[PDB]
Ligand binder design. Sequence first.
Ligand SMILES: O=c1cc(N2CCOCC2)nc2n1CC[C@@H](C(F)(F)F)N2C[C@H](O)c1ccccc1
Ligand code: NA
Ligand code: NA
Length: 554
Amino acid sequence: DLKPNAATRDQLNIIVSYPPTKQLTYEEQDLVWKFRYYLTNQEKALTKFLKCVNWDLPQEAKQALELLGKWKPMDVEDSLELLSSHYTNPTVRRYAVARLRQADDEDLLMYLLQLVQALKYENFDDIKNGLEPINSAEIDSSQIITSPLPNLEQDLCTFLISRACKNSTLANYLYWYVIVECEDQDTQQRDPKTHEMYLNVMRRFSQALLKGDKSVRVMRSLLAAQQTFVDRLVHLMKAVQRESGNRKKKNERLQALLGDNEKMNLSDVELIPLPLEPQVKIRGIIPETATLFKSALMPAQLFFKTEDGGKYPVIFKHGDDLRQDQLILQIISLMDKLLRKENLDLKLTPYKVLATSTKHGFMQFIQSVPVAEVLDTEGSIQNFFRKYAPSENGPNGISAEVMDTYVKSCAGYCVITYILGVGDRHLDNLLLTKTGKLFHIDFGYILGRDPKPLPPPMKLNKEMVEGMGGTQSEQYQEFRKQCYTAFLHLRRYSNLILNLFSLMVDANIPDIALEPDKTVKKVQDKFRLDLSDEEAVHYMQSLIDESVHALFAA
Ligand SMILES: O=c1cc(N2CCOCC2)nc2n1CC[C@@H](C(F)(F)F)N2C[C@H](O)c1ccccc1
Ligand code: NA
Ligand code: NA
């Protein structure tokens, strides 16, 4: 093989270190191609090499595939890039699936939402041909599972179904994520072949479950029971939303219908996995504690009876698209897991969000109080903390543990909302727990979007700073430390985070759909990959200093 000199090797290392959005010039491509055999020893060089290939040229594609098979095994992040819209070559996509096969189900679950999006770039004929022995509108996606009839060998569809058949948690999310994709009216009208593909994925999944062993066949019946339960809940929600009168009158209708099990079948059901969190098995909804929230959207707070005698409160929305919130909460869940991997638990609240359609879905209810209500009832965050968690020896008369949780969650969310460009940040969408956990909700505005003009990049307020004990407190120093530490940890996983956002470009998420080609760059810019770790610390410190000076000047 051709060996490049020291100067060329250094030049190739700079190209290999380029950020994800960085496009290689034709001259850089010629250089990478010239030393393709040398670069085979570097797993990070593979994604740069594949950017040099014109997939419309059969021999160039063939040359690339031979090197792909000789290359040092790629990482999971790089396999996620090979499943994006950029790579439609079936063999390239098979190699990416071969890498995901080596990953644990725990990691696979973290990327499942994006892997379901990646099906849009798969071979639609291969997915259809996998079906064993009409107009798409005649196939109600919700009726597939409820109507059972009396190393490079696997594509993405075959792989996802195979793993789902062995894991009930994976099967739950695969079922619901595919149902939402089938229910996408924008996909149904603009790309009927994609809508047909998603129906075929569901039909393939139902077929594989029915061919499985005793536990696998039971999984199909449990998915059918969940679909039927959700269908019944949607019918109930429609009746409550149509009920003439005030919220009290709607609550009476809500409780009466939930209480009528012979008609609705919602309060007394056989043990079924909760769609929102399938590890939690439910007995039904408690009729007498179900109420609507004060909102024109009419969302309901529902308490589920768990198998172990517990109560699982949820928010169920009908007539709203939960997909943007679903993506943000799954990214927050991933960010929390990555921070925990680096041994940093910032006491975040990645509450569960699951769309059951593009029109309805669940949200895990965390017992908490919005900051606006905290000020109206107690006056301040510190007063709320002194009332529910007092300590004579603790900082400002508050439990040390509660204060530590507050500082950590403030810092965690400060860094996360900045990276995700979360807008519309007011005191009603900032929530607080009696354990000290501060968290964000309602992700209607992301990636720099805001209802007000000129939004600040850092989402800090006077109430947050006062809750810590001011700018001169030991808590404020801890907050700054946790901010730059969380920032450095997340920057290390920028390749992963960006590759997952790249898989969401065609997902019909409002704030992504607005500018799909600029989405990845918006997130990439927040990581400041142009700066070294030391420079990133000072940049994060500058963001905090500016935000604090600006908020106090009010
Ligand atoms: O997106 C979300 C997420 C969410 N979480 C609740 C805490 O656990 C995590 C999820 N709550 C809401 N929203 C949309 C706006 C309203 C809704 F849905 F009622 F309209 N609320 C309820 C309101 O904030 C509320 C009311 C009373 C107490 C606490 C909270
Ligand atoms: Na039908
Ligand atoms: Na947490």
